[PDB]
Design an enzyme around this catalytic site. Structure first.
Site, PDB file in Angstrom:
ATOM      1  N   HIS A   9     -43.971  -9.859 -21.146  1.00 49.32           N
ATOM      2  CA  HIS A   9     -43.321  -8.533 -21.257  1.00 49.32           C
ATOM      3  C   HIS A   9     -42.355  -8.379 -22.434  1.00 49.32           C
ATOM      4  CE1 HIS A   9     -44.021  -8.536 -16.654  1.00 49.32           C
ATOM      5  NE2 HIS A   9     -45.058  -7.979 -17.252  1.00 49.32           N
ATOM      6  N   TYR A  66     -40.033 -10.332 -23.616  1.00 55.67           N
ATOM      7  CA  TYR A  66     -38.749 -11.026 -23.516  1.00 55.67           C
ATOM      8  C   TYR A  66     -38.768 -12.268 -24.420  1.00 55.67           C
ATOM      9  CZ  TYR A  66     -37.939  -7.544 -19.955  1.00 55.67           C
ATOM     10  OH  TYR A  66     -37.782  -6.341 -19.304  1.00 55.67           O
ATOM     11  N   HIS A 113     -40.761 -17.216 -17.092  1.00 54.64           N
ATOM     12  CA  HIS A 113     -41.060 -15.831 -17.491  1.00 54.64           C
ATOM     13  C   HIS A 113     -41.352 -15.838 -18.980  1.00 54.64           C
ATOM     14  CE1 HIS A 113     -41.320 -11.635 -17.955  1.00 54.64           C
ATOM     15  NE2 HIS A 113     -40.313 -11.232 -17.196  1.00 54.64           N
TER      16      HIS A 113
HETATM   17  C1  LIG Z   1     -39.147  -2.709 -10.517  1.00 53.66           C
HETATM   18  C2  LIG Z   1     -39.963  -3.813 -11.138  1.00 53.66           C
HETATM   19  C3  LIG Z   1     -39.315  -4.964 -11.506  1.00 53.66           C
HETATM   20  C4  LIG Z   1     -40.031  -5.988 -12.107  1.00 53.66           C
HETATM   21  N1  LIG Z   1     -39.368  -7.124 -12.483  1.00 53.66           N
HETATM   22  C5  LIG Z   1     -40.085  -8.178 -13.004  1.00 53.66           C
HETATM   23  C6  LIG Z   1     -39.469  -9.397 -13.281  1.00 53.66           C
HETATM   24  O1  LIG Z   1     -38.272  -9.601 -13.036  1.00 53.66           O
HETATM   25  N2  LIG Z   1     -40.248 -10.408 -13.811  1.00 53.66           N
HETATM   26  C7  LIG Z   1     -41.578 -10.258 -14.086  1.00 53.66           C
HETATM   27  O2  LIG Z   1     -42.208 -11.207 -14.577  1.00 53.66           O
HETATM   28  N3  LIG Z   1     -42.188  -9.077 -13.782  1.00 53.66           N
HETATM   29  C8  LIG Z   1     -41.450  -8.050 -13.233  1.00 53.66           C
HETATM   30  N4  LIG Z   1     -42.103  -6.888 -12.915  1.00 53.66           N
HETATM   31  C9  LIG Z   1     -43.587  -6.776 -13.117  1.00 53.66           C
HETATM   32  C10 LIG Z   1     -44.296  -7.105 -11.785  1.00 53.66           C
HETATM   33  O3  LIG Z   1     -44.073  -8.465 -11.449  1.00 53.66           O
HETATM   34  C11 LIG Z   1     -45.818  -6.834 -11.772  1.00 53.66           C
HETATM   35  O4  LIG Z   1     -46.390  -7.693 -12.737  1.00 53.66           O
HETATM   36  C12 LIG Z   1     -46.127  -5.408 -12.207  1.00 53.66           C
HETATM   37  O5  LIG Z   1     -45.401  -4.493 -11.402  1.00 53.66           O
HETATM   38  C13 LIG Z   1     -47.627  -5.133 -12.090  1.00 53.66           C
HETATM   39  O6  LIG Z   1     -48.091  -5.459 -10.785  1.00 53.66           O
HETATM   40  P1  LIG Z   1     -48.324  -4.323  -9.662  1.00 53.66           P
HETATM   41  O7  LIG Z   1     -49.346  -3.327 -10.175  1.00 53.66           O
HETATM   42  O8  LIG Z   1     -48.838  -5.040  -8.449  1.00 53.66           O
HETATM   43  O9  LIG Z   1     -47.012  -3.658  -9.385  1.00 53.66           O
HETATM   44  C14 LIG Z   1     -41.397  -5.864 -12.312  1.00 53.66           C
HETATM   45  C15 LIG Z   1     -42.036  -4.671 -11.972  1.00 53.66           C
HETATM   46  C16 LIG Z   1     -41.311  -3.646 -11.366  1.00 53.66           C
HETATM   47  C17 LIG Z   1     -41.987  -2.359 -10.988  1.00 53.66           C
END
Ligand SMILES: Cc1cc2nc3c(=O)[nH]c(=O)nc-3n(C[C@H](O)[C@H](O)[C@H](O)COP(=O)(O)O)c2cc1C
Length: 366
Positions: A180, A182, A177
Site C-alpha cells: 500500500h 508505505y 506490512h
Molecule cells: C478501514 C481499513 C483499514 C485498513 N487497515 C489496514 C492495515 O492496517 N494494514 C493493511 O495491511 N491493510 C489494511 N487495510 C486493507 C485490508 O486489510 C484489506 O486488504 C482491504 O480492505 C481489501 O480487502 P476487503 O475487500 O476484504 O476489504 C485496511 C482496510 C480498511 C478498509
C-alpha cells in the site's frame, strides 16, 4: 462441503478453517496504547482454530501516519497487548501482529518534535492524495527525508525489536506490512524509489530492504512465526511499478531464498489486490505469485464467500482474508459457514475513536 472449512496447517498452527481476519487500522488505540476496546473487538471476531491479523502496529516513534494506532515498541504497549492476546487465545484463535511503518505517508502532527517523515526518497506523495488528520480534516503530505543506509539498518532493527516484543506479548507471530505505498513499498516500487545507491535501481537493489527486514525478524523469532504482506499492483499513495508481475516475482524469489537459507518456511505470503470490479487480469497475477512461492498463500481484496470457496477449491490460495466484511460482521466466519446474509458497514466510523460506536456494536446473528 465447503473447502473454506477444511483444516489447514500453517506451519506449527493447526487452523480449523481458512477465513482470515485481514489487518485493519481502526484508530481506537488512544495515544498508541492498546485499549480494552481492542480486546472486545478481536474477541468478537475470534473463532476456535481461526487466524486473525491485527491492525498495523507501530515499530518506533516515527512509524505512524494515522491517529491512535497501537504500537509494540514500548513495554507499556506489550503489557496492554498481552491482555488482548489472552482473550483471543481463550477463544482458541491464532493471532499475528502486523508491524507497520508508513514511511513518507505521515505528517508533522504524527512525528516526534514535528520532524520530517522518512523514506527511500526525498519526494513527497503528490497532492492527488491527502492524509487524515487527528481532527478529521485532510492535510498535505510533507516532503520526507531520504535515509542513508545506516539509518536503513536501524529501521531493520526496529522491526526486529518489535517482533521480539510481539512474542513477549504472546502473539503467535508477526506480519510484515510491505503493501500500500508505505515504507517497504517506497523501496520496492520503481515509481517511488529514485535512489542511486545499492537500495535503488535494479530489482535486486529495490528488494534489498524487504529482504533485510524479513531476514532480521526470521532470525529473531523464527520463520514459521513470520508472515509477509505485499501489493505489487495497488496504486495507493503514488505506489506504481513499471512491471508489477516482475516485481512481485522478484520479491517471491527473495522469500524462497530466505527460507532455503534458514532451513524453514515462513508462516505465509499474503498478497492483496484492488478487488473492485479487471477480474481476470488480477486473478492471473494472484495465481502467478502463488505458483512461484514455496509455501502458504493468503489471497486478499474483494473476495466474496463464493470467490473464497473457489480460490481454495481450485488451489489458487490456501487461506482467504476478509477486511471490510469483518468490520460489520463479527461472526463473519459463521455467516460464511451458514451462507447467512451479511450486514453493511458504516464507512464513517472506520477511523473514529469511540470504543463502541462503529467498532464493537455491530450485532451477531440473532
Ligand atoms: C478501514 C481499513 C483499514 C485498513 N487497515 C489496514 C492495515 O492496517 N494494514 C493493511 O495491511 N491493510 C489494511 N487495510 C486493507 C485490508 O486489510 C484489506 O486488504 C482491504 O480492505 C481489501 O480487502 P476487503 O475487500 O476484504 O476489504 C485496511 C482496510 C480498511 C478498509
Amino acid at each position: 462441503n465447503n473447502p473454506l472449512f477444511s483444516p489447514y496447517k500453517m506451519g506449527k498452527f493447526n487452523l480449523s478453517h481458512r477465513v482470515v481476519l485481514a489487518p485493519m487500522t481502526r484508530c481506537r488505540a488512544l495515544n498508541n496504547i492498546p485499549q480494552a476496546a481492542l480486546g472486545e473487538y478481536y474477541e468478537q471476531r475470534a473463532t476456535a482454530g481461526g487466524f486473525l491479523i491485527t491492525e498495523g502496529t507501530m515499530i518506533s516513534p516515527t512509524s505512524a501516519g494515522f491517529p491512535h494506532v497501537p504500537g509494540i515498541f514500548t513495554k507499556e504497549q506489550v503489557r496492554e497487548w498481552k491482555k488482548i492476546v489472552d482473550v483471543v487465545h481463550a477463544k482458541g484463535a491464532v493471532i499475528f501482529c502486523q508491524l507497520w511503518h508508513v514511511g513518507r505517508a505521515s505528517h508533522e502532527v504524527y512525528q516526534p518534535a514535528g520532524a520530517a517523515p522518512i523514506s527511500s526518497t526525498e519526494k513527497p506523495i503528490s497532492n492527488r492524495w491527502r492524509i487524515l488528520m487527528p481532527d478529521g480534516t485532510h492535510g498535505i503530505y510533507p516532503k520526507p527525508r531520504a535515509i542513508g543506509t545506516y539509518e536503513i539498518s536501524q529501521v531493520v532493527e526496529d522491526y526486529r525489536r518489535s517482533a521480539l516484543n510481539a512474542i513477549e506479548a504472546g502473539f503467535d507471530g508477526i506480519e510484515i506490512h510491505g503493501a500500500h505505498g508505505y515504507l517497504i513499498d517506497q523501496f520496492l516500487k520503481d515509481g517511488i524509489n529514485d535512489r542511486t545507491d545499492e537500495y535503488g535501481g535494479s530489482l535486486a537493489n529495490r528488494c534489498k530492504f524487504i529482504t533485510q527486514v524479513v531476514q532480521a525478524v526470521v532470525s529473531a523469532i523464527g520463520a514459521d512465526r513470520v508472515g509477509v504482506r505485499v501489493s505489487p499492483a495497488i496504486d495507493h499513495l503514488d505506489a506504481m511499478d513499471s512491471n508489477p508481475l516482475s516485481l512481485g516475482l522478484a520479491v517471491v524469489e527473495r522469500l524462497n531464498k530466505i527460507q532455503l537459507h534458514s532451513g524453514s518456511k515462513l508462516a505465509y505470503l499474503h498478497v492483496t489486490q484492488p478487488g473492485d470490479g479487471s477480474e481476470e487480469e488480477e486473478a492471473r497475477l494472484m495465481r502467478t505469485l502463488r505458483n512461484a512461492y514455496q509455501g502458504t498463500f493468503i489471497c486478499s481484496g474483494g473476495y466474496t464467500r463464493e470467490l473464497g470457496i473457489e480460490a481454495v477449491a481450485q488451489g489458487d490460495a490456501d487461506l482467504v482474508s476478509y477486511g471490510r466484511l469483518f468490520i460489520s460482521n463479527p461472526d463473519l466466519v459463521m455467516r460464511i459457514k451458514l451462507n447467512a446474509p451479511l450486514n453493511k458497514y458504516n464507512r464513517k466510523t472506520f477511523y473514529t475513536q469511540d470504543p463502541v460506536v462503529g467498532y464493537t456494536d455491530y450485532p451477531f446473528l440473532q
